[PDB]
Task: inverse folding
């Protein structure tokens, strides 16, 4: 079982977060149906409505967050082809809790150097250094907390 | 040469109508590809995934908000505020007030985080440069300028 982000035991509620890549995010908030859900069920307020002032949007218990840099990733790996009839597709990542682990060994630290001669200030070098490791949570050959989904994003 | 140098900043009738030559790219916009509120959201998406990034006018880091300003030329501005959908957005989500509603007392209008300002003198400019022809099948087209921050310099 995939652990949800927030549980309500009574009136049973399980919450998840989906990360879109802006070409499946415009098809999700711009469909002909399901668009009167956030103008007929939201309060009559201008500064909080994501219809007039766009943002993330919740529907059926899942929060839809936009990450624009998934188009930069997925175009380089060949998702602009390899669909049905060579159509562009994009991935959608529905993730729960503890899906990616992060192991910190050293926080990023800065430092400077006077290279050529410290008296005749002809050269200087600044730099920054880090020790880190990032890995998706995997146990017994299975994804621990991710559900991957592939949809056909035309990109018009 | 202005095309095939800005492929992520020029939006013709659709993204499937981009061309490296300018005269062919203006021949791919139909007379039925009018300015609805679902196609201006495509232009906001191109402004958030440009390879040198376009600075938005106002940023909210939490609940992520990025604001832009679009300048219409009154023939794409009446198609934007007069479409069959997206018109109950400013009568079902605005407060019941007469002197502030742009449905009864027209003005600029905000939708999905972009402000739509009308400039009536873009019709006088674009008619003199031949935009009343040179569409798909010699149809009239008009330009819409979605601009961010520091787009025109002024030297006094």
Result:
């Amino acid at each position: 079982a995939i652990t949800p982000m927030q549980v309500d035991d009574d009136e049973g509620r399980e919450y998840f977060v989906a990360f879109h890549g802006s070409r499946t995010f415009r098809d999700l908030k711009g469909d002909t149906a399901m668009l009167n859900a956030n103008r007929e069920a939201r309060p009559r307020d201008v500064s909080s409505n994501p219809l007039l002032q766009d943002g993330d949007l919740i529907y059926e218990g899942v929060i839809h967050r936009e990450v624009p840099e998934i188009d930069a990733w997925a175009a380089a790996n060949g998702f602009n082809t390899a669909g049905a009839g060579s159509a562009p597709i994009r991935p959608v990542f529905l993730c729960g809790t503890q899906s990616v682990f992060l192991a910190y060994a050293q926080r990023p630290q800065a430092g400077t150097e006077k290279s050529d001669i410290p008296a005749l200030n002809r050269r200087m070098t600044v730099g920054m250094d880090e020790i880190i490791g990032v890995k998706k949570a995997a146990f017994n050959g299975k994804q621990h907390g991710v559900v991957m989904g592939f949809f056909g994003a035309a990109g018009d | 040469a202005f095309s095939a140098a800005n492929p992520d900043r020029l939006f013709f009738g659709s993204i499937s109508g981009y061309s490296a030559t300018w005269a062919t790219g203006l021949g791919n916009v139909d007379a039925a590809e009018t300015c609805t509120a679902a196609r201006v959201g495509v232009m906001k998406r191109l402004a958030m995934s440009a390879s040198p990034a376009i600075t938005p006018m106002q940023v909210d880091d939490d609940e992520g908000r990025e604001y832009f300003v679009a300048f219409h030329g009154s023939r794409t501005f009446r198609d934007l505020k007069g479409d069959t959908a997206m018109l109950n957005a400013n009568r079902e989500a605005r407060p019941r007030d007469v002197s502030s509603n742009p449905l009864l007392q027209d003005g600029d209008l905000i939708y999905e985080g972009v402000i739509h300002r009308e400039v009536p003198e873009i019709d006088a400019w674009a008619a003199a440069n031949g935009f009343n022809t040179a569409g798909a099948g010699s149809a009239p087209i008009r330009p819409v300028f979605l601009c961010g921050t520091q787009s025109v310099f002024l030297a006094y």
